[PDB]
Design an enzyme around this catalytic site. Structure first.
Site, short mmCIF file in Angstrom:
data_model
loop_
_atom_site.label_atom_id
_atom_site.label_comp_id
_atom_site.label_asym_id
_atom_site.label_seq_id
_atom_site.Cartn_x
_atom_site.Cartn_y
_atom_site.Cartn_z
N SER A 26 0.79 -1.23 0.00
CA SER A 26 0.00 0.00 0.00
C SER A 26 0.83 1.29 0.00
CB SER A 26 -0.94 -0.01 1.21
OG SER A 26 -1.22 -1.36 1.60
N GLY A 62 -2.14 -4.09 0.21
CA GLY A 62 -2.44 -5.19 1.10
C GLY A 62 -1.49 -6.38 1.00
N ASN A 83 2.49 -6.21 6.23
CA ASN A 83 1.22 -6.93 6.29
C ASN A 83 1.29 -8.38 6.76
OD1 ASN A 83 -0.32 -4.66 5.40
ND2 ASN A 83 0.29 -5.12 3.31
N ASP A 107 -8.16 7.07 7.80
CA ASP A 107 -7.65 6.03 8.70
C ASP A 107 -6.37 6.69 9.30
OD1 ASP A 107 -5.48 5.86 6.86
OD2 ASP A 107 -6.14 3.97 5.98
N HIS A 157 -2.41 5.62 6.28
CA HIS A 157 -1.95 5.75 4.89
C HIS A 157 -1.78 7.21 4.47
CE1 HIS A 157 -2.37 1.44 4.08
NE2 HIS A 157 -3.52 1.54 4.73
#
EC number: 3.1.2.2
Length: 175
Positions: free
Chosen positions: A9, A42, A71, A152, A155
């Site tokens: 990401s 992801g 991740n 969020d 990011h």
């Protein structure tokens, strides 16, 4: 001459097109060196590895930036599996006559002591072992100002991408 970015990401651009993500901006700043973003949001290190043979064959890159591992934990990988998966990635890149560039990954939150210390330690270990550049995490020292975040907590937004490109340009220019 091609730099292949093999990330998640943070390199793919979360909820934005790849042409807004920092690798594309880096590309513009550079005819001298072509930049190919193979990052998918992801991505685990396992997914990265699964695609890597095809990508190396496709883009025949001289350098490969590896931004993976972030991740793995939330996907249930023990640090050992992350280590062995990254090892294989570095092996593959070297085998394809490209220079691996390995970015140290910083975890967002406290996943506990045993995991954090173990996870963090993997990258200096692999860097020494393969004798390859260990780049710091995306503007590690400075961090990211709050206004560059998405809704969020995690990011970088579209507006942040030019600054990340500047920073990456400086990291990569001697490599």
């Amino acid at each position: 001459d091609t730099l292949l970015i093999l990330g998640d990401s943070l390199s793919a651009g979360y909820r934005m097109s790849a042409s807004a993500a920092w690798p594309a901006l880096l590309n513009d700043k550079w005819s001298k060196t072509s930049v190919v973003n193979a990052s998918i949001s992801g991505d685990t290190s396992q997914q990265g590895l699964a695609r890597l043979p095809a990508l190396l064959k496709q883009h025949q890159p001289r350098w490969v930036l590896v931004e993976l591992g972030g991740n793995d934990g939330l996907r249930g990988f023990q640090p050992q599996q992350t280590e062995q998966t990254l090892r294989q990635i570095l092996q593959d890149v070297k085998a394809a006559n490209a220079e691996p560039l390995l970015m140290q990954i910083r975890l967002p939150a406290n996943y506990g002591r045993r995991y954090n210390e173990a996870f963090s330690a993997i990258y200096p270990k692999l860097a020494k072992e393969f004798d390859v550049p260990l780049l710091p995490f995306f503007l590690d020292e400075v961090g990211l100002k709050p206004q560059w975040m998405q809704d969020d907590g995690i990011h970088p937004n579209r507006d942040a991408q030019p600054f990340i490109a500047d920073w990456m340009a400086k990291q990569l220019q001697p490599l």
